Design a protein around this nucleic acid. Structure first.
Lengths: 342, 142
RNA sequence: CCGAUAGCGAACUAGUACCGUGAGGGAAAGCUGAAAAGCACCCCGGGAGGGGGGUGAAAAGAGCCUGAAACCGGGCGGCGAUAGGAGGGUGCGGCCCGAAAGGAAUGAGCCUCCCCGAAGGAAACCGCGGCGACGCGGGAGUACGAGGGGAGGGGACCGG
RNA sequence: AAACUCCGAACCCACCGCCGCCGUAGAUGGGGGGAGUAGGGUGGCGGUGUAAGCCGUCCACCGAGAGGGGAACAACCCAGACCGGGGUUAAGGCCCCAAAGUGCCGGCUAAGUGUUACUCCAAAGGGUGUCCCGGGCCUUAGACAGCGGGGAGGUAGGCUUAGAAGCAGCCAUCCUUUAAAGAGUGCGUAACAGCUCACCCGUCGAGGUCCGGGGCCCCGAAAAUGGACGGGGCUCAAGCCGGCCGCCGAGACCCCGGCGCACGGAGUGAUCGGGUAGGCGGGCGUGCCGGUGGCGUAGAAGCCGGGCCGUAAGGUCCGGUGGAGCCGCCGGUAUCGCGGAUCCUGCCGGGAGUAGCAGCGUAGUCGGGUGAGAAUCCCGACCGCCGGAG
RNA sequence: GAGUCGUCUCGGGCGAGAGCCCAUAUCGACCCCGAGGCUUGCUACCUCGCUGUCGGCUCUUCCCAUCCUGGCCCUGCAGCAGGGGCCAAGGGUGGGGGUGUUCACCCAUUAAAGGGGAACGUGAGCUGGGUUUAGACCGUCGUGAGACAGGUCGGAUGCUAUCUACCGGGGGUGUUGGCCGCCUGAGGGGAAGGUGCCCCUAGUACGAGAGGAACAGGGUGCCGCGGCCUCUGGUCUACCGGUUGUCCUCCCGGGCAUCGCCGGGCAGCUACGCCGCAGCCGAUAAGGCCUGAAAGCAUCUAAGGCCGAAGCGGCCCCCGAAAAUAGGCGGCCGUGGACGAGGGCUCGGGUAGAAGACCCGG
């Protein structure tokens, strides 16, 4: 070459690529640690559709038409089945105690008493003790579960943790407490027009090539033996192979966070109530390819979402606001679509 | 067993004396391995600790040198480098030492605190840092 | 003088088998038992194979006198899934067995006492010095010491 | 001033005497037989060449010689090594890893310098950075810096020039008078004017400013897998330099016995013990012969496993197997002893139960028959391939 | 390659000299001293029972004496724009035309189109153009055979991974007797961001004028990376239709020409499609200073103290109970030759998927 600087192909900012250790998304940012309500609301991705909206954010100047794809998701109502208490140790955060509170319970693979009533009352009393002191406790988080039963993709509860914020430890405890005996809403935690993060384990390709994972540029005039091979891997010394070099192995089934997708619309059904703005509750005829009946609470969120069709996705509020665009409270939907995916 | 409050204590003197004692058959527990003191120019003490952590064997296999970011581990690692770990006595020696962060004991055991090098003088030494400050800077939890 | 991976290539259907257009080149293959009594008859097995039972010796039952090592399977004894390698040597522990040829029961490993005693050589405390670290005098070549001798106790391993 | 000398050490060497030591278990010297006949290396003194390298010379040593220490490190240090035991030091070290000092006194240090004899460890220059010594200036004859007052008169010094009037520039740089004055340090003006310094007295009421050697520490100082003081870590030291003291620590050195060698006859050795090339000498084992003397079915050799002895080569015994031959002793003899030859041959394992049984114009599949067993044997049906040429 | 450092590259010290005057705005001789291993050469140490050459291609690591971006200082800095100096490897540093060419020359773009080491990186990865063999011609020289750092044409790139490395996937123990689900965050990794334009500022500051900046706010592009197909584009030997030859007598309905060919295209997979990818703070460099001495004053330093980088950490994104400090919580369980909680194999499908696993229904 001639010492030609070449930018890296693949990344180390996302590498390694491998299988997720749980099908529950991972979290290392908490946007509702000191603030009420859960970290968004979880559903199953129905599919996608598209919608035409009016600026909103200026494409050129405000008042012009913009195209936007939107991912329509059947969410179940969620319901608190467990209270988690923490005590802060000296090696990190450690689990004080828990209350566990109960055919879906049967489909779940999780362990079951066998003296339900008894165990539950002891954990509950234990918790009141912890709550009183009150500074033992430094934060409280909620074990929360999905409830699929009108949804055909899977019917087992996927069980996850979301924190429940509050100003102080006693307040988080009261809020969480009211919640166990109840259902929950897309409406209660979240509202239209915030920018929100999306967390999901992306679609599994299975094992894929250097061509696919890292990208491999093509070569010279004619190549007898292939153009999809690895080339050099390295010198004579280093005497060992690195990990920064093109290989084949897993792509997908990896957890990904994509930031800041604007919340367009909330409703319920779909296609059993017809509105002229905020989306017409867009449900394709012939149904969605490879996905079960829709009829429950839903949300249609902007742009892309990590996760292909038929996969449990989770939503988290944002860890940053937009930074040269203004937020818009309540997006505007100029005209609608009713297209088929067929 | 010895529970040493290593507040004030130069890490090296504590480790040398500790590394011989554990080998004799004794148990040492260090409490307060974050409030302990290291003399020296601030700049060089940070450059040494960062460099170690940064490694990156050549880009890092997921093997080779790791150095920890937290001070509690740094003392514990320092006494282990003073012991072996592929000799019987040494490999055992590392399990006779444990670090507890801060003091969550109600005991203080045997204390060395003599002014000979092993404990600082705060009015005769031109410059020092507390170790906890540097651990924060490296990116540790503490 | 040599003795069947030796002496003729060849001790046994050998200059044979075999190769090469040809000229020409060229091996390997010795041993039941006294006598074949070389296994009747029976169960099983598709079975002519093999197994069970009867076969002086069969571990002489068919290239069968004898029957090595490398090697394969199972088992016994030891080790073993958080720790390091020219695979061990020397010392000292564990576990494991050891009928014989060894040494010892006419006393083995072992233990105890008494004494001799090479090279070497303290302690307590005291006195006097030394800025002090510590030295010096007395304790004292003493206590102590490898090794050896004798006597005694015990009674089966110890060596390996 | 290699190849000059009015001159010239230390030092080398010849010879005599002495002294020392060595020698009649034979030195000093001669003759004979048998060999081997690639060198290296630290230092000193060199010659060449930038150098590394090459080549002379002498050399401890490695070569052929261990052991303990130098982190490890052919030749740097200590030390020359029969067997076993006990003891004490040497080189070197004494913060931990690791035996033994969180040693002592004092000075140097603030760079993480250094903690490295080393094979490992970068310079000229320069710093009111330090500490320590030197003689000068100078101290109420007290400006060392501040500060209160200072910066005269002749005069514009002259020339040049409108102006050069301290201040475009050139050269001179003189005299009177004193808180005080330089034909003027800088600013300023077109040039003046104006602002101001050195300077001085006096207050502050002191010891003041200097210069010059040395030791050290800083600056000078940029490199490619994580590499550095052996590692960790160490800043009143676990650093540096100058003293000092107590210990740790070798096959050395010491010591007891045993053993060989040398010497002593038909015990003794401070003055003995490493070992390749090579020389010399002794024994064992192997096959067969001869002589001599024994053993065997009441159980040979061989095989296997175990015991025991001898520094050893090697031998012997026991138990099992085996089912006919077998030793010892002495004197002879050689197709006489194997770890290697990219050795020859036989047997056997890993690789592996992997690759191969796919690639070219790519064929079977369903019933039924037979049989110990049927995807691929046969019969029937259906479908192909070849078709002037599988 | 090692050794070596004359040669080469680069630095430092001294400052002759010109720059109207003024050595240092800038340029800088004579001479003297280091550093590096990047050119050349020396060495004969290592290999002749082989350690295969150069260049390109592809793929990656590291270094700074740093081309650009950030932060800074001077000026013979009016502005615009240069010149010179300091920090700094986080990121970027391109495409073409000739040469086999490393190197070098050229064009227009660019914020800039930086260099060097890694077996003169990279042939058990490709290529085999160049060094280059056995064939041949020409020039030169030779009696001749025959030669050439002269020119030139054409002239093989082997190997099924045993060991070990790295990327992905399973099976088990330890797991302080086992177990099911949920978490903690030791540490490891990163560039998840980089960069440029335009308008407003402003025809302003500044300038005699010509000419012409900056802070800050909006819109857009580019590159890298990651994800996603509803739109639009690709494909689609699912399927459907049109059609040549030929065969079945044959309309119908089919075979074959190795999808016959052609035309359309759903799901799905993809870009030539779409969407996403912060700030701030703390501590610091270079720098600017405060108080303030050594040296009663002055002085950014000798101590104390205030700010201040694209660099450093947090924040952010990726992985992570085999972290032996082997973790926490909650629940479930035991108690040949008694009894038997969890769990798999089974079945119907995948959100999954090389085997296995994973997941869900039964």
């Amino acid at each position: 070459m001639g010492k030609v600087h070449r930018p890296r192909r693949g990344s180390l900012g996302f590498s390694p690529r491998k299988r997720a250790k749980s099908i529950v998304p991972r979290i290392r940012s908490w946007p509702k640690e000191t603030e009420v309500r859960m970290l968004g609301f979880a559903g199953y991705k129905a599919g996608m559709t598209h919608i035409l909206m009016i600026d909103d954010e200026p494409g050129l100047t405000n008042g012009k038409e913009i195209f936007m794809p939107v991912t329509i998701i059947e969410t179940p109502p969620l319901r608190v089945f467990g209270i988690r208490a923490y005590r802060m140790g000296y090696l990190g955060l450690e689990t004080a105690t828990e209350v566990i509170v109960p055919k879906l319970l049967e489909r779940r693979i999780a362990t079951l008493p066998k003296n339900y009533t008894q165990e539950m009352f002891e954990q509950k009393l234990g918790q009141l003790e912890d709550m009183i002191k009150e500074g033992e406790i430094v934060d409280v988080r909620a074990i929360v579960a999905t409830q699929p039963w009108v949804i055909k993709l899977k019917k087992k509860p996927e069980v996850m943790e979301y924190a429940i914020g509050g100003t102080s430890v006693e307040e988080k405890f009261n809020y969480i407490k009211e919640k166990l005996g109840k259902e929950l809403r897309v409406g209660e935690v979240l509202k239209e027009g915030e920018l929100l993060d999306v967390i999901a384990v992306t679609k599994g390709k299975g094992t894929q090539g250097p061509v696919k994972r890292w990208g491999i540029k093509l070569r010279a005039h004619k190549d007898s033996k292939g153009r999809r091979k690895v080339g050099s891997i390295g010198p004579w010394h280093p005497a060992r192979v690195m990990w920064t070099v093109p290989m084949a192995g897993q792509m997908g089934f990896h957890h990904r966070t994509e930031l800041n997708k604007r919340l367009i619309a909330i409703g319920e059904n779909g296609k059993l109530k017809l509105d002229e703005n905020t989306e017409i509750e867009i449900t394709p005829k012939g149904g969605f390819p490879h996905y079960g009946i829709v009829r429950s609470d839903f949300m249609m969120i902007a742009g892309s979402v990590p996760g292909a069709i038929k996969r449990i996705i989770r939503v988290r509020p944002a860890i940053r606001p937009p930074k040269k665009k203004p937020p818009v409270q309540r997006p505007q939907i100029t005209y609608v679509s009713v297209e088929s995916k067929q | 067993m010895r529970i040493i409050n290593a507040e004030g204590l130069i890490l090296g003197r504590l480790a040398s004396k500790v590394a011989k004692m554990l080998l004799e058959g004794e148990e040492v527990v260090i409490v307060n391995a974050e409030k302990a003191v290291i003399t020296g120019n601030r700049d060089v003490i940070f450059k040494k600790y960062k460099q170690r952590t940064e490694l990156r064997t050549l880009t890092n296999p997921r093997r080779g040198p790791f150095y920890p970011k937290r001070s509690d581990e740094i003392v514990r690692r320092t006494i282990r480098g003073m012991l072996p770990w592929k000799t019987d006595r040494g490999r055992k020696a590392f399990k006779r030492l444990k670090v507890y962060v801060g003091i969550p004991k109600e005991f203080q055991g045997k204390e060395l605190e003599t002014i000979i090098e092993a404990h600082v003088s705060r009015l005769s030494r031109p410059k020092y840092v507390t170790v906890g400050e540097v651990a924060k800077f490296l990116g540790g939890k503490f």
